[PDB]
Amino acid sequence: PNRLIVDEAINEDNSVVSLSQPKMDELQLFRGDTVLLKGKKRREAVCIVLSDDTCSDEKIRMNRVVRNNLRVRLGDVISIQPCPDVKYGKRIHVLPIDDTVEGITGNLFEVYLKPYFLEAYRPIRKGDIFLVRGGMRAVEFKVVETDPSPYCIVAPDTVIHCEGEPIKREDEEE
Secondary structure (H helix, E strand, C coil): CCCEEECCCCCHHHHHHHHCHHHHHHHCCCCCEEEEEECCCCCCCEEEECCCCCCCEEEEECCCCHHHHHCCCCEEEEEECCCCCCCCCCEEEEEHHHHHHCCCCCCCHHHHHHHHHHCCCCEEEEEEEEECCCCCEEEEEEEEEEECCEEEEECCCCECCCCCCCCCHHHCCC
């Protein structure tokens, strides 16, 4: 019932997944609720849930970034549940993935992170990998640390910092 089949995104961004309204009613979810998704390799994601009048009841629409964080492919099954009491973050540390920032010399906060999170109130989990468009090439980042942990909402006063050596792609899951 809360096990749903992974389907393609239409407009969903990295922070949202969509269910049919009948499924939302069955699971007693409100549009805008934070949900915790469980996928392969014991991976989790936290997203906002929206309803989609083109989603099939047994399916959940989620973009490539969310599927990758959950280590799932189209057609895999995940579970969805409410994720209550996610608090606003005080401070988060994110680092870029090496092979995406080679040759990119700019202020990654100004170019990529500030506009990605700006007034967006995104839910995030320690260990998430997310993709941000910007500047000269899209860059991927990993959430290495959050306070509170492992879940928070990146609110306007959450301090986002990125300083440090980029993460090797081979270490995404560490």
